[model samples]
Target: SIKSEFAEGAAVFVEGVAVFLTMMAAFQNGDKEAVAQYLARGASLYTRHEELLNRLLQKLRREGNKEAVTLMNEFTATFQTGKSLANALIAAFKNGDDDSFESYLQAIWKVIAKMATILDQIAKAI
Candidate 1:
């Protein structure tokens, strides 16, 4: 059911937010191992969210819900931006570029914030 699927997607998103916060702390503490662990967790959450969202998108498309489909597509694109920010964050960390790392970390949360807005719209549209 769409309700169940939506619940799961929102759950993953909330979990991702938690992981994001912890990742910042891990980086602050200068624990490479913990950072890597949280990075992995964040990536896993991203993948799961993407899949769940795509499923919802496809369902909407099939049902001819154009408005919802458009919203979902926008959400997915915003998510891709987050993914790119994550990669840049990894690059910055590896190169010991503290400034870039901090910038990318904040940028990622901005993307996540936009994502939350889209999810709210999706909930209303559906």
Candidate 2:
């Protein structure tokens, strides 16, 4: 169930990322609200994804499978990193610093990429 939730949340995140990127492009063209809306949407989606990840981790912990448990722990750690980056992004957005925002965006992207790789590996291992 949590895996299904994660899948759905991931879809939301994909949309959010596209919207955020488009908004960023628009921001470069002098559209501030578009950028703000997209940033808000992205944060919301990331929050939802993180919640689903927590549920998935809880489920994995309760499953009693050694390999699954180990993989899930690693996955949880990755998720934690992602969550931390998201939090930092929120702070940067609140502070309204372009350089910080850019850095946060790059950090978030890296976390997402790393998370995807780890998830893929876990899937293969499973």
Candidate 3:
């Protein structure tokens, strides 16, 4: 059932978006750990909204300071999963290509999983 599939897809994405944004906002004002954790959490969490995430990531990459570049590969780590999940989610909305119900289910779950991985990392960072 196409309707049920799309409905389910939206449901999980909404769930992930809620938790992701909340976690990112919770530890906003502390130390380097705070910044890294939040940024890390943000990378995977924002997968549901790829276009906005792309701009945010690009902004980080454009940064020129030495310490910023060295502290990490910066935003590069998120690039792989972010792109995979991004295209998957976007594919859930095709009409002519007409994605199957299971396709939407699979992609939405990837969305949930990608975000959950980052959240787990933030927890472990402690």
Candidate 4:
């Protein structure tokens, strides 16, 4: 039987993964306008997921599960990294400079790599 909490976490993970993939695709395509749109959409999604994760964290805290608490902390860290990447992407697109765009894109890619590792862990946990 699937734990209800794990299901919720899985949903959050899926959303995060979708945002990451969309951003990566936009970056690879090198369409500045498309990148802007994707970043905007990703920001909205991340905000929603952050709220949900916060609620989950509260519930977990109430339950007093130490291991779960540790895992949640790790998840929060990963989520922040994803958000940072999204923000960087937005800045790059807004700058509209080739050098800035490339620099930011590379940074975003690094963050995505970290996010992928986190997603793997989340999947295993769920």
Best by lDDT: 1
Provide the lDDT at 95 for model 3.
31
Weakest lDDT window of 10 consecutive positions for candidate 1 = 77-86
Q: Tens digit of lDDT per residue, candidate 2, span 15-72?
A: 7668757865865675666777777787677677677767766766676556756776
Residue lDDT tens for model 3, 33-115? 44345435545555544443343334434654344333223233554545665455334323323344235434545656665
Quality of model 2 by C-alpha lDDT: 0.68
lDDT tens readout by residue for model 1, 1-126: 566777789999999999989988888887778878888888888899888987877778878877778898899888876677788998887888978988898888888888999999988888
Clashing pairs in 3: none
Which digits, one per residue and each the tens of the lDDT, describe model 4 over residues 31-81?
Answer: 667767767776777777777777767877887766666777887887776
TM-score of each: 0.90, 0.71, 0.32, 0.71
On lDDT, the stronger of 2 and 3 is 2
The most accurate candidate by TM-score is 1
The TM-score between candidate 1 and the true structure equals 0.90
Model 1: lDDT of residue 114: 88
Full-model lDDT for every candidate: 0.84, 0.68, 0.43, 0.67
After TM-score superposition, the amount by which residue 123's alpha carbon in candidate 1 deviates from its true location, in angstroms, is 0.9
Q: By how many angstroms RMSD does model 3 differ from the true structure?
A: 16.8
Question: What is the Å distance of residue 67 in model 1 from its true position?
Answer: 2.3
Candidate 2 ranges beyond 4 A from true positions: 1-6, 23-30
